[PDB]
Design a protein around this nucleic acid. Structure first.
Lengths: 130, 88, 98, 88
DNA sequence: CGGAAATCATAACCACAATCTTTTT
DNA sequence: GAAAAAGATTGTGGTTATGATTTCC
């Protein structure tokens, strides 16, 4: 993969309401993050061109965020089934920015009897064995 | 740590740019932070769909549902193809 | 190796220390390797005498007890004439609470 | 924190032991703390020699001097060899 | 800022009891 | 309807290969 699965799971699990994650979810996300990076970068490079530069810069990313409606959840990083209606979507972005501080990226154990069995069990070379 | 590794983000950015192009340190850092927000934004919305349906495992269709909902529809069709063709 | 950076940090935790040559942490990385190996070798002797194949804390404790030059470690599990070294060990143990 | 990583220490302990052998977690923790005190111990005497000698950088000869006076002479000759093969 | 070298961090690997989801009763 | 058994799938940590970051230039 071009993006590390475990690190994706970590960011997902910083939401306390997340319990378990299917094995596809990180795999899917790695590919979706890729598309998100390509789109974000593509539109940022426009602003660099408009400004007659060869170097992509923070303020280019900011311009792309500002120009691109569905990127408005990202307005904090650069200070100073159907799609939701712009207004419905707007409320979900506001609730997301409301919840953003409560995110904790420290390791938390969610299933203790699993940890109990994992620390008592045979390992060939760190690995679980039969 | 709350970010994906800046080297990997940097590799993907370069694929969207011309060969000429150069990328500043702060542009890498900004994109790196945005990707993490993307995950959190999608994951929170998928997490709510799971609670409402009284399920406890976030699955791929929950992500795809959130992406359509929050306006990333353009990713959904490629992702479903990506699902199956990887899955073998 | 053993990481150069955390070696340098541990070295510089003594306020008296000041500057450290670049070769010094590399020298310590190998010396700590030898130290770990001797401590382990002699702890393993204890575990054998007690016919276990698992190295336990009390094996390390016995090796620290058995070998004089490990005197300075006496507090962890509660060349110089035998006694000039003893004075350097005592002054070190008293600075450790500081 | 103030210790060398227990995973490095573990790796080195195994090399001193047979395949049959296994190691307790508290035995790894102990060796880890001893390794750190060894550094503090050696560094202490070497640092003392430098302040006696009006110098303020601890070099390798200082460290080697400290091991000889503290009973660790067995390490000195292989350490000298190791220094130079590294090119000092 | 990109690239090479040196240094260091960690993601992936493993398998099963615990737990989640579906089907039976 | 509700309960319960069946069937499906993850979370968990010690080690080390992998590659990410740090240092130079």
């Amino acid at each position: 993969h071009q993006l590390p699965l475990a690190r994706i799971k970590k960011i997902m699990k910083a939401d306390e309401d997340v319990r378990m994650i299917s094995a596809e979810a990180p795999i899917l996300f790695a590919k979706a993050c890729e598309l998100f990076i390509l789109e974000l970068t593509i539109r940022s490079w426009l602003h660099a061109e408009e400004n007659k530069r060869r170097t992509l810069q923070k303020n280019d990313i900011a311009a792309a965020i500002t120009r691109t409606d569905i990127f408005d959840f990202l307005v904090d990083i650069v200070p100073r089934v159907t799609q939701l209606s712009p207004m419905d979507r707007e409320a979900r972005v506001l609730r997301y920015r409301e919840k953003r501080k409560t995110r904790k990226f420290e390791k938390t154990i969610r299933y203790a009897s699993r940890k109990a069995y994992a620390e008592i069990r045979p390992r060939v070379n760190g690995r679980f064995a039969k | 740590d709350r970010f994906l590794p800046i080297a990997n983000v940097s590799r993907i950015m370069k694929k969207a740019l011309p060969a000429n192009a150069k990328i500043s340190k702060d542009a890498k850092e900004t994109v790196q932070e945005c990707v993490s927000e993307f995950i959190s934004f999608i994951t929170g919305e998928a997490s709510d769909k799971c609670q409402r349906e009284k399920r406890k495992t976030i699955n791929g269709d929950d992500l795809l549902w959130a992406m359509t909902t929050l306006g990333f529809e353009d990713y959904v069709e490629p992702l479903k193809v990506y699902l199956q063709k990887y899955r073998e | 190796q053993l990481p150069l950076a955390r070696i340098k940090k541990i070295m510089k935790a003594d306020e008296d220390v000041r500057m450290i040559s670049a070769e010094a942490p590399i020298l310590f990385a190998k010396a700590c390797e030898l130290f770990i190996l001797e401590l382990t070798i002699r702890s393993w002797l204890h575990a054998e005498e007690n016919k276990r194949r698992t190295l336990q804390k009390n094996d390390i404790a016995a090796a620290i007890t058995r070998t004089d030059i490990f005197d300075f470690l006496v507090d962890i599990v509660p060349q110089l004439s035998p006694m000039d070294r003893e004075a350097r060990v005592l002054r070190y143990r008293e600075k450790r609470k500081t």
